[PDB]
Design a protein around this ligand. Structure first.
Ligand SMILES: *[C@@H]1O[C@H](CO[C@@H]2O[C@@H](C)[C@@H](O)[C@@H](O)[C@@H]2O)[C@@H](O[C@@H]2O[C@H](CO)[C@@H](O[C@@H]3O[C@H](CO)[C@@H](O)[C@H](O[C@H]4O[C@H](CO)[C@@H](O)[C@H](O)[C@@H]4O)[C@@H]3O)[C@H](O)[C@H]2NC(C)=O)[C@H](O)[C@H]1NC(C)=O
Ligand SMILES: O=C(O)[C@@H]1C[C@@H](C2CCCCC2)CN1C(=O)CP(=O)(O)CCCCc1ccccc1
Ligand SMILES: *[C@@H]1O[C@H](CO)[C@@H](O)[C@H](O)[C@H]1NC(C)=O
Ligand SMILES: [Cl-]
Ligand SMILES: [Cl-]
Ligand SMILES: [Zn+2]
Length: 575
């Protein structure tokens, strides 16, 4: 019994490395060169990997996991018993794969055209418009156009996608696809735990929302901002209003402190996409963590091709399951926002390298939120005025202090409600609570309820605004990013204490701390081999998710915001 199970996992591991490596190659080749040919190859490799999953998953299910003694083997076999989409009958699997390909392609090639003019792609063009334009009608054209062309075009696929991903989930023992996604956390109390974390961030978010709302009132006019209502969703500097720091110029707490134009500084100093990833690589090795291999620099796609290729620009980090080949695919722009994204992606890469010697079934983060958080942790230190000054991107007070926390909060605090609601919506689609009759109406009920946002143009039949957000057509879970924003502050607090930092948490910069790197390395090397509380305990000395670190980080800003909003008589929220 035990020996057959040991031999099975050994055979599964050596055969999976080969099949997954070939699939990743074809998937990469399509993502970096969308053509009829690369798609057909990709759909073909999808059947090869499905055949492999079906063979070994079927055998995995013949083992009584209850009777297995070794806990590691037990854990691998139980995981291999989930065939995912390979549980579907051949017809449904082919349909599902084609639906996923059509949805992701549709999103990644959509364009928005000026009337009788040029057509803009999401990256860099529409992203830049949302970030820099300060004109209501210009932002409205981009915001509505992107949903008309990306969102509406996904709607025809989504009901069948839901049917098929749910059918696969049920064939693997779950009640629907959202049940299966939540199980990735191995936490029966996940929904309650996440809800309590969200509620703990309400004071900060409501106060930030009211303050930003007041500033938008000042710039966009009293006829267009209701000081007791939700904020129009196109005015926050980002296509999904998920992060707000691109409107920092409109909301500066102390404008007497002049802001240095960081984008012009990077450009003026010759920064390139390569330089940005090199700086991130240097931060990782400064902690004693691993450098990316030479292969990474030869094979990655660090900027948008200029040779006619159509590509998937949305940033992602790729493990090719051979322990040597790791790559980033990002249409990088030279600015601070994408430097932070670059660090985010390099954290994925770091995780891949740290757990590369585990069995492939355990080459995942402790939970998906851990995988999303690593790069963000370092980026917190990178974003400090001290570190940015050392990169010659800033010029060397309480005013500057509150200014910096506001910049951070526009990204870290504003993202909390957005990242919470995406899968609140999808979980209820998957469990049948939301039908295609009210996809979009229920999306905006959550946009209002959690983010306090409203659409600038009333939605109509045919709209499918969730389809205008990458992770929806690409079928990538989102609660991981909510978890990441909570725990990345817990990790920051812990590493800063390990590094000997005293004083306000937001002044910590862990650059070159070997003590901090070692905490992270010991956790990352566990991969998915243990329940995630153990990785949490290795980093922080305790096992729970907690918002206390994030609240401690932003405490000075919470006090400043309350005083400011009180002074102006704001009514928090949106009744
Ligand atoms: C339950 O099973 C797991 C997994 O076993 C592994 O997979 C099976 C399918 C089968 O192939 C097994 O043969 C195979 O080991 C066990 O977990 C493994 O435990 C061993 C314990 O030694 C670990 O071995 C380590 O491997 C490292 C990389 O090669 C190596 O560096 C380590 O050396 C360290 O210690 C020596 C001591 O002399 C020191 O000299 C070194 O400098 C270094 O510190 C060590 O040899 C495996 O990595 C583990 N693999 C996994 C996946 O966890 C587990 O022990 C078992 N449980 C029970 C109760 O039997
Ligand atoms: O864009 C978003 O919405 C979120 C939030 C953003 C984060 C970055 C730093 C600053 C704060 C926000 C990062 N991100 C991403 O999707 C980037 P990924 O690599 O996780 C996207 C991964 C998609 C799945 C995948 C995996 C491997 C290969 C191909 C596809
Ligand atoms: C893109 O794919 C086509 C067809 O597979 C191929 O001929 C072409 O060389 C590829 N381009 C690049 C830059 O790899
Ligand atoms: Cl939207
Ligand atoms: Cl997740
Ligand atoms: Zn990520």
């Amino acid at each position: 019994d035990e020996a057959e199970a040991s031999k099975f996992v050994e055979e599964y591991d050596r055969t999976s490395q080969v099949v997954w490596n070939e699939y990743a190659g074809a998937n990469w080749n399509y993502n970096t060169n969308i053509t009829t040919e690369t798609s057909k190859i990709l759909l073909q490799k999808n059947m090869q990997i499905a055949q492999h999953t079906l063979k070994y998953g079927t055998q995995a299910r013949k083992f009584d996991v209850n009777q297995l003694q070794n806990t590691t083997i037990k854990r691998i076999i139980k995981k291999v018993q989930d065939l995912e989409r390979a549980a579907l009958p051949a017809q449904e699997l082919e349909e599902y794969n084609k639906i996923l390909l059509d949805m992701e392609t549709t999103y990644s090639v959509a364009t928005v055209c000026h009337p009788q003019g040029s057509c803009l792609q999401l990256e860099p063009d529409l992203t830049n418009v949302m970030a820099t334009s300060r004109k209501y009608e210009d932002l409205l054209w981009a915001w509505e156009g992107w949903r008309d062309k990306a969102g509406r075009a996904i709607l025809q696929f989504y009901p069948k996608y839901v049917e098929l991903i749910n059918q696969a989930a049920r064939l693997n023992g779950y009640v629907d696809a959202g049940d299966s996604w939540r199980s990735m956390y191995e936490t029966p109390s996940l929904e309650q735990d996440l809800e309590r974390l969200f509620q703990e961030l309400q004071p900060l978010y409501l106060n930030l929302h009211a303050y930003v709302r007041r500033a938008l009132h000042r710039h966009y006019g009293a006829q267009h901002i209701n000081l007791e209502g939700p904020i129009p969703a196109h005015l926050l500097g980002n296509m999904w209003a998920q992060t707000w720091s691109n409107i920092y110029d409109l909301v500066v707490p102390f404008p007497s402190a002049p802001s240095m134009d960081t984008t012009e500084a990077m450009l003026k100093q010759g920064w390139t996409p390569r330089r940005m990833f090199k700086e991130a690589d240097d931060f990782f090795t400064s902690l004693g963590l691993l450098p990316v291999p030479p292969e990474f620099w030869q094979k990655s796609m660090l900027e948008k091709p200029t040779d006619g290729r159509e590509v998937v620009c949305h940033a992602s980090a790729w493990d090719f399951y051979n322990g040597k080949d790791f790559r980033i695919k990002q249409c990088t722009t030279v600015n601070l926002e994408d430097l932070v994204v670059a660090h985010h992606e390099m954290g994925h890469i770091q995780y891949f390298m740290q757990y590369k010697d585990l069995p492939v079934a355990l080459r995942e983060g402790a939970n998906p939120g851990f995988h999303e958080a690593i790069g963000d942790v370092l980026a917190l230190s990178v974003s400090t005025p001290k570190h940015l000054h050392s990169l010659n991107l800033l010029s060397s007070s309480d005013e500057h202090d509150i200014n910096f926390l506001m910049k951070m909060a526009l990204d870290k605090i504003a993202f909390i409600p957005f990242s919470y609601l995406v899968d609140q919506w999808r979980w209820r689609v998957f469990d049948g609570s939301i039908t295609k009759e009210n996809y979009n109406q229920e999306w905006w009920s959550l946009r209002l309820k959690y983010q306090g946002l409203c659409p600038p143009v009333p939605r109509t039949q045919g709209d499918f605004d969730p389809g205008a957000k990458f992770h929806i057509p690409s079928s990538v879970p989102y609660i991981r990013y909510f978890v990441s924003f909570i725990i990345q502050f817990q990790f920051h607090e812990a590493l800063c204490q390990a590094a000997g930092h005293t004083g306000p948490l937001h002044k910590c910069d862990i650059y070159q701390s070997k003590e901090a790197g070692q905490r992270l390395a010991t956790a990352m090397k566990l991969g998915f081999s243990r329940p995630w509380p153990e990785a949490m305990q290795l980093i922080t000395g305790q096992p729970q998710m907690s918002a206390s670190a994030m609240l401690s980080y932003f405490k000075p800003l919470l006090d400043w915001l309350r005083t400011e909003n009180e002074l102006h008589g704001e009514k928090l929220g949106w009744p």
